[PDB]
Symmetry: D2
Subunit: 346 residues, 4 copies
């Protein structure tokens, strides 16, 4: 089969020919229908040799949808042809977190060497993929696979981050979204669907501000040194109830701390190595909690799919072939994909 | 009347003779029965002139209990002689936070010049004190005033910090308490009363570790460079579900980040200027939230009093006269009060 | 001043001429700008002499908005001319429930003889009204008073009922609204604003089903014997996550029990004397909780006003003069007010 | 192997000799170390033929602990010899409820024919038992199996019921426990461990009131017509924040409605056919919610085990052999087991 793999440290990913896998006991083979590109793939490929621990080669793609092609021995609850999304942050299935479906917060996965597809195990950017267990498949019914693939991370991750503090986001609340890319453009729409928060979007790029308004942001303002004052003008001095920072640069985290309300929240979702919130007296308002959330839970993925099926999420995508996978990664690096890049195999 | 006041920047507080106040409309005059000393009073008195904004003179004491002495015009929900605790973090009473009793998170108090007794308004370290409004009094019935005074901050503040994340602290959870002083020795007991968390106490001083065990800590660990490893030995690699840091020095916050569990919590309650948690990827576990809480809510103070009335809080105190107030502050500075210092007027 | 009063048991309310009140200490005099009619006023007026305990005469109107006309002695936080909504379910202000703003669940109000305006104290269906305390006023700014008056009960009560179980109403959930009248037509819109629930409305009247669709219901079902099966056809066998019954007749409660999901909720909001849910094994699904909520909380009223100010609530009203008040009650009895009746004084 | 089975409608269960099962793919074979008797087994055996749908014969025992004896093909995460408790209310594993571990509220189990061990599938009252999937085993380490077996239902069910409303049970709250038997005596201890609620126990039997005080109830009062007034004397007119009714007779539900506080809770846990709370205006306080909870969740079972391992649960048991199983059921029917009956193979 054709796949896109990271094969050597510091190089671009390459299109390869590797064996179509066969599912072992408990596993499911999917024919992949769509595979999302995530900025996290750039972080992974930019790691120096000393830091990179995901193994080479690595089939990329941790945003996967497909149809069930073959059932491994003992697998029940799915039939051949069923359309499914892949739950990404595989856990042990047995710990207290995993028992609640919160496999993103599994305490045993690292020690057991359990890694996500595309991030240590073979990913979705290939004609076929293996999923370890039936509990890591969620049915999508007739959802368009191209718009469905991003739900698995671009949807799930902001959904989880918002869910952690949803009770704060009542009528009269304000939620700031920093970074209107793959994650952020979905984050805006989640906020509109599951809360009555006023949504203020922030981006460096005026076209992304336009995207923010297109997907339902109440206001969209330019990132950088003037953003905190501009946000405060809109919120009137109380500041923002919650800030969801999908950039996570020191500058955006600083903006977040300068606008967050008393008893509010900052969710540092975007990854920029070394950047951090400074949570201390006189550096942040009283009661304003800060967290770096990770991916999301099993039940959250089902809820994201339910939002998509109800017409609440307009996922902006651009489609690529497998052969164009490396080109698509170049596009993502330069910031020229308006929403999510999605590879559609054959 | 006799009072203890901060009267000049950089000097020790002094015993003064000032007029006994009379309550205006809506106000209540209390005969003070006990006034707690808090380490925050040291922070206040150590502020340079440029930072200090609480006015001079200032009658100290933001931990107050008393009996109703005189009712201001229109006050009817209390009778003369009623034993009451003073709710400290006065708010506007009208905003969304205040409507929920969360006057600690009032968004209008600063603009309206509303300050706590002992922290901008006249405090409890005096024979009598004024309370602005009936809603800032909570009945204590026949509770011993000496042990009751600390409930208003040494109890309330840890109670609020714990309450923010109480759902995390189920059976099998671990809570670390750093600093077994006024607040910390009460924090341990709150954890034991309202949760099934295993409690690990951390202090520099062996006698404070003894105090921790006396009030129900399951284990005691010496603070400093070995603490993180010692805590991990006790928690077995998962780390601590929650860390309540009543010291808030950079070293204790660092210990907290090194032991907190995935999807756990660090509550930075202690104040050490400049110190902060560094909340960013690779510097803290996924999902581990961090906050600097402030004081507590009206209903929380009622709950703290209910714990005390049910025999769940053994408050360790040493009693001082008003004349000994300055000496008691020297004792607190040197770390020689085993629990809470409490002034009992005349 | 002109007012509408219930003056004798079993008779229609009458237009009267009574003295314009003067505010005592702590009280506020409002010039009333709008006064809502509620079906609860019909229940009150239909009580026989033996049951009726609200006093005669009674100025009706427990849905009140106005402008501050006079401040009683000692009142702060409002100026003459301020536009305000009246928080209805007055409590003692001091108990644990009231400290959280939950004066609807005050444990002391009955013993202290604290009754709501229009329901034991003089109501809003008059040129002027007294409010007991500043904490019972919520600013509305420039909101149209006619559409604002219903927020105080037609908005607040469904808002509270929904808020009790909001975490259940995630994407993929279904909420049934039974009774598309004053409360129900607002309930539908609240559900759409604060949740991603699919909303199914139920009414006896096809024109009310049309109203339900106009205000955002996803589906509309005729009430009566076929309703339960019709709702199950829409929900596909799982049943409805929550049922908000604004009728509360035995037949509607029975429908609710027959459609509610496992681990779901029935909120019996409508009042029909003698009607009750039967909560026992084999009579209701496992985990499906049932409650009769009452009115709402202070912070909830603020949230309702915030929804209105954000354009999320289209309140359907018909306006009446004070002289037409009795006629408007006849209209409400016959079911001919499409939404909420609102009296606008002079 | 020896087992205790319900074999004909209306008869007492019998001790039988049946084949030791072998685990299929994904399944685990346990050597049973303890099997709890539950009053629900009496309800099941008292069903007439028309209502009984669990199949005959049925190996009883839905409270099971054991050691892993054999792993079925493909099973990982457990080794032979591991001490485990059996999670009872098996669900589909895939629906929204099951994804949260809330298999007790699974919406698909009935349609898929998934039934609990001892309640449609073969139970724990036997030398060996099959468990369908690894996710239905919870490690217990060195916990005494006799005291551990009741954790799976006598512990789990009250734990779930309490957990549904735990945020209500702050300092100053009162929780009433009606029925100090298998479930109720554990419910009291759960309340003491995870809340600061004052606990008032209610029972018909003075010896059970003594049990309640022994396991930490703050007061223990006689059930019946005077109970509501006696409870109100203790709570001072506000009533009880929550009432956990482990009897569920109409009389106890009525007591519950007569004492519950405004914005409180009644959890109808005990099963008495036809009995129900009457939740309507003028019949219950404003805001007092009522529910019939069912069993508990996967993560709750882990939490119950954690309470037991921390020494927070003193489970009162009486031990029986397999041969004594039928005799033990007679004891349970007459109300003469002080706590939980447990069969040890
Ligand atoms: N915490 C997690 O679990 C998790 C999961 C998925 C992705 N991520 C991270 O989230 C981030 C976003 O991922 P993505 O795929 O949406 O990225 P993307 O490349 O699709 O989008 C980036 C967007 O951010 C904007 N941007 C960049 N710098 C900015 C600044 N200083 N201010 C405002 N806007 C700015 C860009 O203009 C663009 O719109 C990445 O760091 C990624 O690794 C984290
Ligand atoms: N967040 C709030 O709203 C709030 C309210 C009250 C107090 N505070 C702050 O909480 C802190 C504690 O106040 P207190 O009155 O309980 O103080 P205290 O002087 O009574 O107690 C200090 C304790 O911390 C211990 N300690 C000091 N350094 C330590 C270290 N490096 N590691 C471990 N233990 C250490 C001491 O040995 C002592 O037991 C102060 O900074 C105070 O200002 C905050
Ligand atoms: N719980 C509380 O705190 C609280 C507060 C306010 C009102 N209420 C009660 O809520 C109820 C609704 O009040 P309202 O002012 O909105 O009433 P309303 O007269 O404006 O509306 C009644 C609506 O219910 C519909 N209806 C009547 N019988 C029905 C049935 N069997 N099935 C379906 N629909 C039916 C009518 O067609 C109409 O659309 C009343 O009983 C009132 O007393 C309760
Ligand atoms: N909801 C669920 O998922 C679930 C799970 C397990 C058990 N149950 C049910 O819980 C109930 C309790 O089971 P158990 O095994 O603990 O029973 P048991 O036979 O061990 O205990 C019964 C106790 O209730 C007392 N009692 C009986 N009638 C009473 C009354 N009127 N007032 C006060 N006390 C009274 C007895 O004196 C005894 O102490 C049963 O109906 C059982 O079927 C329900
Ligand atoms: Zn990603
Ligand atoms: Zn795990
Ligand atoms: Zn203090
Ligand atoms: Zn305020
Ligand atoms: Zn009404
Ligand atoms: Zn009250
Ligand atoms: Zn049972
Ligand atoms: Zn299921």
């Amino acid at each position: 089969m054709k796949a896109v793999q990271y094969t050597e440290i510091g190089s671009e990913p390459v299109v390869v020919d590797i064996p179509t896998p066969t599912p072992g006991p408990g596993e499911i083979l999917l024919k992949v229908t769509a595979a999302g590109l995530c900025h996290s793939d750039i972080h992974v490929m930019d790691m120096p040799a000393a830091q990179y621990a995901l193994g080479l080669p690595l089939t990329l793609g941790h945003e996967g949808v497909g149809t069930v092609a073959e059932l491994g021995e003992g697998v029940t609850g799915f039939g051949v042809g069923d359309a499914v999304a892949v739950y990404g942050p595989w856990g042990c299935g047995a710990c207290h977190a995993c028992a609640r479906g919160r496999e993103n917060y599994c305490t045993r996965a690292a020690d057991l060497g359990i890694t996500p597809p595309g991030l240590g195990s073979p990913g979705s950017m290939a004609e076929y993929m293996i999923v370890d267990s039936a509990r890591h498949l969620v049915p999508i019914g007739d959802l368009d696979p191209v718009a469905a693939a991003p739900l698995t991370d671009a949807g799930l991750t902001p959904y989880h981050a918002i869910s952690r503090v949803l009770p704060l986001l009542g009528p009269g609340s304000t939620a700031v979204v920093i970074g209107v890319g793959g994650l952020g453009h979905v984050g805006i729409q989640i906020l509109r669907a599951v809360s009555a928060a006023r949504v203020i979007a922030v981006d460096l790029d005026d076209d992304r501000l336009a995207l923010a308004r297109e997907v339902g942001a109440d206001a969209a303002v330019k990132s950088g040194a003037g953003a905190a004052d501009a946000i405060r003008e809109l919120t009137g001095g109380q500041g923002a109830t919650a800030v969801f920072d999908f950039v996570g640069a020191q500058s955006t985290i600083d903006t977040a701390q300068q606008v967050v309300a008393v008893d509010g929240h900052i969710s540092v979702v975007g990854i920029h190595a070394g950047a951090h919130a400074k949570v201390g007296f006189f550096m942040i308002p009283f009661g304003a909690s800060v967290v770096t959330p990770y991916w999301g839970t099993r039940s959250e993925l089902m809820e994201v799919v339910a939002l998509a099926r109800a017409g609440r999420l307009d996922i902006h995508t651009e489609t690529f072939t497998l052969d164009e996978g490396p080109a698509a990664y170049r596009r993502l690096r330069e910031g020229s994909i308006r929403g999510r890049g999605v590879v559609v195999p054959t």
